[PDB]
């Protein structure tokens, strides 16, 4: 048994929107401490780690550690049936989603067929990062989409003054300079960095932009980039991108 009541149901809508195109099937790890999902994409170039803490939910009950294999596009389809201000209750073979309309007596309960997965959770060791940039999420989404007009890869270069995003292609090349300054760009660095990443993965990551007005990029040499979106006062959505 499991029951979690999320007043701000749009969080769960947005989460599914930011995962569905990147990951087809994932195991939702449910426990007394909250909801966790970890999965690499098909090509194992990226890994997402979602944490929704139990104290972020307005009601949270879980008497057993559950591992629910979910088709994320099927779950996205159901969450498209929730209004953006609905109260969403997750309840648990099948995952039940109950949408309570904020205004007007409308209650939707959806029951979602689960599947058996065997996700062999990969261990993520936290570590010290040479550079950490916190920047508006919309700005970062702008960057990755703009540069994907130019080239297939982005060179990220972080130095004391600022961060630069560079891409090259047939058309020519581009360079976007962000200098450290809610709407601010802060750079915490202890070692300058220069890494190359696939823009097509970054542009999947930026679907999480409506979850957070700000994004944190954590970078070091010979380690995956971390693209981190903080979710209200309840958790985060972290993307890990293997550098080329």
């Amino acid at each position: 048994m499991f029951e979690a009541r999320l007043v701000q149901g749009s969080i769960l809508k947005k989460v599914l929107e930011a995962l569905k195109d990147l990951i087809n099937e994932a195991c939702w790890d449910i426990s007394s401490s909250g909801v966790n999902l970890q999965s690499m994409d098909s090509s194992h170039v990226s890994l997402v780690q979602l944490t929704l803490r139990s104290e972020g939910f307005d009601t949270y009950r879980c008497d057993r550690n559950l591992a629910m294999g979910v088709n994320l596009t099927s779950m996205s389809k159901i969450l498209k049936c929730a209004g953006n201000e609905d109260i969403i209750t997750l309840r648990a073979d099948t995952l039940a989603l109950v949408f309570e309309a904020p205004n007007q007596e409308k209650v939707s309960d959806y029951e979602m067929k689960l599947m058996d997965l065997d996700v062999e959770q990969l261990g993520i060791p936290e570590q010290e990062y040479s550079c950490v940039v916190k920047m508006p999420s919309g700005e970062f989404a702008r960057i990755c989409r703009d540069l994907s007009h130019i080239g297939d890869a982005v060179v990220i270069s972080c130095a004391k003054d600022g961060v630069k995003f560079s891409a090259s292609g047939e058309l020519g090349n581009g360079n976007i300079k962000l200098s450290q300054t809610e709407e601010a760009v802060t750079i915490e660095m202890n070692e300058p960095v220069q890494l190359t990443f696939a823009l097509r993965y970054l542009n999947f990551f930026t679907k999480a932009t409506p979850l957070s007005s700000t994004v944190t990029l954590s970078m070091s040499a010979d380690v995956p980039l971390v693209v981190e979106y903080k979710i209200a006062d309840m958790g985060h959505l972290k993307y890990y991108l293997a550098p080329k």
Binding site: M40, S46, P224
Partner: peptide, 8 residues
């Protein structure tokens, strides 16, 4: 293009 398991 390396992969995540290569690092984790």
């Amino acid at each position: 293009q390396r992969c995540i398991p290569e690092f984790f």
